[PDB]
Design a protein around this ligand. Sequence first.
Ligand code: A1L52
Ligand code: A1L52
Ligand code: A1L52
Ligand code: CL
Ligand code: CL
Ligand code: CL
Ligand code: CL
Ligand code: CL
Ligand code: CL
Lengths: 173, 173, 173, 173, 173, 173
Amino acid sequence: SSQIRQNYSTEVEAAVNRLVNLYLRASYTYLSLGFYFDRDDVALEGVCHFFFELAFEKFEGAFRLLKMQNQRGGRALFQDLQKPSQDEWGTTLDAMKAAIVLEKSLNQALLDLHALGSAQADPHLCDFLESHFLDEEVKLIKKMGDHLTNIQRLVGSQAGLGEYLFERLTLKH
Amino acid sequence: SSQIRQNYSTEVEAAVNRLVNLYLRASYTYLSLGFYFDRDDVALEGVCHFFFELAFEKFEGAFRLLKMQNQRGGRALFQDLQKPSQDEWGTTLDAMKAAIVLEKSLNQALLDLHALGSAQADPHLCDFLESHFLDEEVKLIKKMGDHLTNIQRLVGSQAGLGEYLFERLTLKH
Amino acid sequence: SSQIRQNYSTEVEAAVNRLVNLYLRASYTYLSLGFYFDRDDVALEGVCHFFFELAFEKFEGAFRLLKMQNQRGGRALFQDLQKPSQDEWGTTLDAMKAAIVLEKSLNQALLDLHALGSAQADPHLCDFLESHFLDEEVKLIKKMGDHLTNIQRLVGSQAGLGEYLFERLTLKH
Amino acid sequence: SSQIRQNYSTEVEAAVNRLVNLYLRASYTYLSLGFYFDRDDVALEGVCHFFFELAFEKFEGAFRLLKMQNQRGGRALFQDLQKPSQDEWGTTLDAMKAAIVLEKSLNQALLDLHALGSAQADPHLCDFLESHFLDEEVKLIKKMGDHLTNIQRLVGSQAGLGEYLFERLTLKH
Amino acid sequence: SSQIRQNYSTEVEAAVNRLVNLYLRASYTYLSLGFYFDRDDVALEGVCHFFFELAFEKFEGAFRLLKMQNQRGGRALFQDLQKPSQDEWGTTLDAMKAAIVLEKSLNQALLDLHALGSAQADPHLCDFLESHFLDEEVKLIKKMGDHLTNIQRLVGSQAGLGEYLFERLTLKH
Amino acid sequence: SSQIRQNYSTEVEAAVNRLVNLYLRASYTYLSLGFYFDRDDVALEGVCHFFFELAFEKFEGAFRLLKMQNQRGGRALFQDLQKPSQDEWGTTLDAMKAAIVLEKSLNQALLDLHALGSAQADPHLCDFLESHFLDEEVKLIKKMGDHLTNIQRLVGSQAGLGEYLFERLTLKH
Ligand SMILES: CCN(CC)c1ccc2nc3c4ccccc4c(=O)cc-3oc2c1
Ligand SMILES: CCN(CC)c1ccc2nc3c4ccccc4c(=O)cc-3oc2c1
Ligand SMILES: CCN(CC)c1ccc2nc3c4ccccc4c(=O)cc-3oc2c1
Ligand SMILES: [Cl-]
Ligand SMILES: [Cl-]
Ligand SMILES: [Cl-]
Ligand SMILES: [Cl-]
Ligand SMILES: [Cl-]
Ligand SMILES: [Cl-]
């Protein structure tokens, strides 16, 4: 087989392909989230833009993973992309809760892959994840947690008002 | 009669004149809406500016229609302009509801005229409507629907607060 | 009623609303004049542009009047807008004669309103009219009189030639 | 045959080739018109330039049609180009009358082709015509009608004077 | 249901959702094509970049469709995304053949949707497709056909040489 | 007849008209050549652009001839334009061979006309041809001969490869 492959296990190759699938699924989920908040009967522009930026971020993550797979001499293999878990995403709070669950699952998949790289003595893979993924994910989950807290603080007894204010004064538009 | 007229039915000519009347009536309605929200006892600058921009837009629509009537060799005929349906327009919500009703009526008149053009095999008219009117109208009705949803979300139990916040944080001033 | 209204009679309020109606009717008349001279079988661009500029001027006059009505704490009330007095406007001479008749009627309405303001000891209204309307109107009627004289001088025995030359060499295109 | 052709009827292909022939014939007619008005014994520069600009416009129309034929996977087929209908074109009025007749024939050919596209459910062809041809033609015929009216107004009893003035004060030089 | 929806059939809404699925599948196919040509054992940079640009184009198409669905008051519904039809894509010729098959299928889906819009008297949908999709697709299929012809001309008896030269001298890098 | 004509024979006048016909026929031939190489199943952009530039050059030649005819007081007379000699033009080699045959025929017509001018003692005509036509033609035929030699050198046993390389590395795109 490969004229470049070196120190790159079949286990890591497969796991990288699985992780691509997870990132692309996450991108799709965020595309659905974005268009839901674009509905005339939802109409929260800042929320919309927040989730579309994440759709792009997750697609970029997948792309970098696929680039690395080729740089290492593995073979990119694509699978079916499962549709997102919901067709409607409820409130901004419901959506941000679903997004943090999603991110925590991606982070766990990154950690799992890092551990596999470590067991396989694959330092390039370990560094790749550390340099492009693990801190980005920590930073994103922190920001989502910050948002959750602010959204929650605003529910009070006037939920609509709080939802509008969060979109207007925290999220970008 | 006309040295330029070609493929331009009397039915379309008349319907174009009727549509001009509808656009000018819509412009007038929006002028009334704008000055109501300019009242010292209403005083919602952003709402005022939103409806004045629409008064100008609807006048522009009428002007383009009249330009096209002449380009086709039809004869512009003006009728009495009915005053707007109300002298006072209630809340921002009441006003935005009235505006979307108005826009839906204009859109239906555009669709009706497009259908007439299609039946008469008048592709220039059909393209004119598609290129300058139908998508502008879809975009406007979408924006009004977005606004309605945000206004509605803000009523809650503190209607005045919500009305102020919508004007301050969504509409332009 | 009004928390701002001071020294502003019901008579002036009503007369201001009537004057708005007159200005908007004048704007409409000028819109009709403009599109007539835009006809392929009339085709006098300079005349067209002259009357469209007046349509805009008269609309601006109405707008300023409505702004002032609100600044004084009166209530803008709109009525039906009568269509213009003609559907076709004849020669440039016929049109300019009709325009000066129209302007003289507006000027008389301004003078009448000024007199009412004076009788009611309403100096703000009197100054408003003097500052934004009376001299603009004198200047416009003078310019129309100048035009009439030039158009008349050009009729001679070659009316078409004179009509073309006036449009080409006096009016803007 | 063609590796790209899709939804593109033989009838439309042939009609497009015929329309190319019509446009190129129109270009040739305008070339003849231009050089006639360039004669020392005619010498109307503005008229000359007006018809040369149209020769170029009609050639561009043909070129776009031929580009589209290839984009659709049809085969451009050229036929003999009939010489223009006259060798001398009379007055500016005679020439502008001949030009509007010509344009009306081109417009009818466009409408005929649009109808064929519609019957064949060929929306690309229908849009192509609407986007690049039908409104350009309406605008041109309107401008020619405007010119005819001005030329006619200037004949009066001093035809030479009127012909000179039209060329000098309306047409570009 | 919807406060904005007007003249927008359930049939069109569903078909738009189906078309989104087709565009996203096409984007995925092009992502796979791109990474295959990025393999160290394939290594055709220009081919890689050509297919990645198409992945982005097809994603943009899907996005515009979803935007329009919301502008019309339809509801975006996502389905599972089928993986691409192949894991390895053979030669540049094999790949470009597969890409033109794919594009022809998308074009047929656009035409089908346009026909449905026409039957339903939905001119906004018909114009949307004409303005953003049908000509882009014709232009792309023409370019692919051009490429196919050039690739085919280069096979001769030295296929590797021809594949290299096409990538180096036609495709962008 | 003519108030400007001087030293300008009927024989030269007629021959100039014939030469215009030849130039316009040549322009048409080059238009056909250009669109053939624009076909999806030919697809040689550089060849396409080479022949379109010549279509424009030959049209310019005709235009200059017609300008000169009027400057001399002759009368431009147009005839039917024969369609080009072929509907399909074969290889780049076949096309360039046909183009040099065409150019040699134009050059001979120029030389013939120069000789007629010389016999008629018409130095203005002789200079006009020398200054705007004879050297342009020599330069063009030299360039075509250069191209023929390069195309011929590239046929070898891999004709497609050679045809691609010539288009890519010699002709402009
Ligand atoms: C409202 C019924 N009527 C009287 C028939 C209106 C309404 C609105 C108008 N708005 C404009 C306008 C708006 C923006 C920029 C330029 C212009 C203009 O030149 C003339 C106008 O004339 C109007 C007449
Ligand atoms: C009149 C019948 N024939 C010969 C078939 C014409 C007529 C007009 C033409 N006008 C152009 C032209 C005009 C403006 C800018 C570029 C071009 C050009 O590149 C080629 C032309 O070729 C023409 C051929
Ligand atoms: C391939 C299947 N999936 C997951 C559903 C894709 C494919 C391609 C995509 N391309 C973009 C994209 C491309 C250019 C510029 C911006 C963006 C963007 O913001 C989001 C994207 O998201 C994508 C998802
Ligand atoms: Cl599968
Ligand atoms: Cl009446
Ligand atoms: Cl009433
Ligand atoms: Cl023949
Ligand atoms: Cl499912
Ligand atoms: Cl003949």
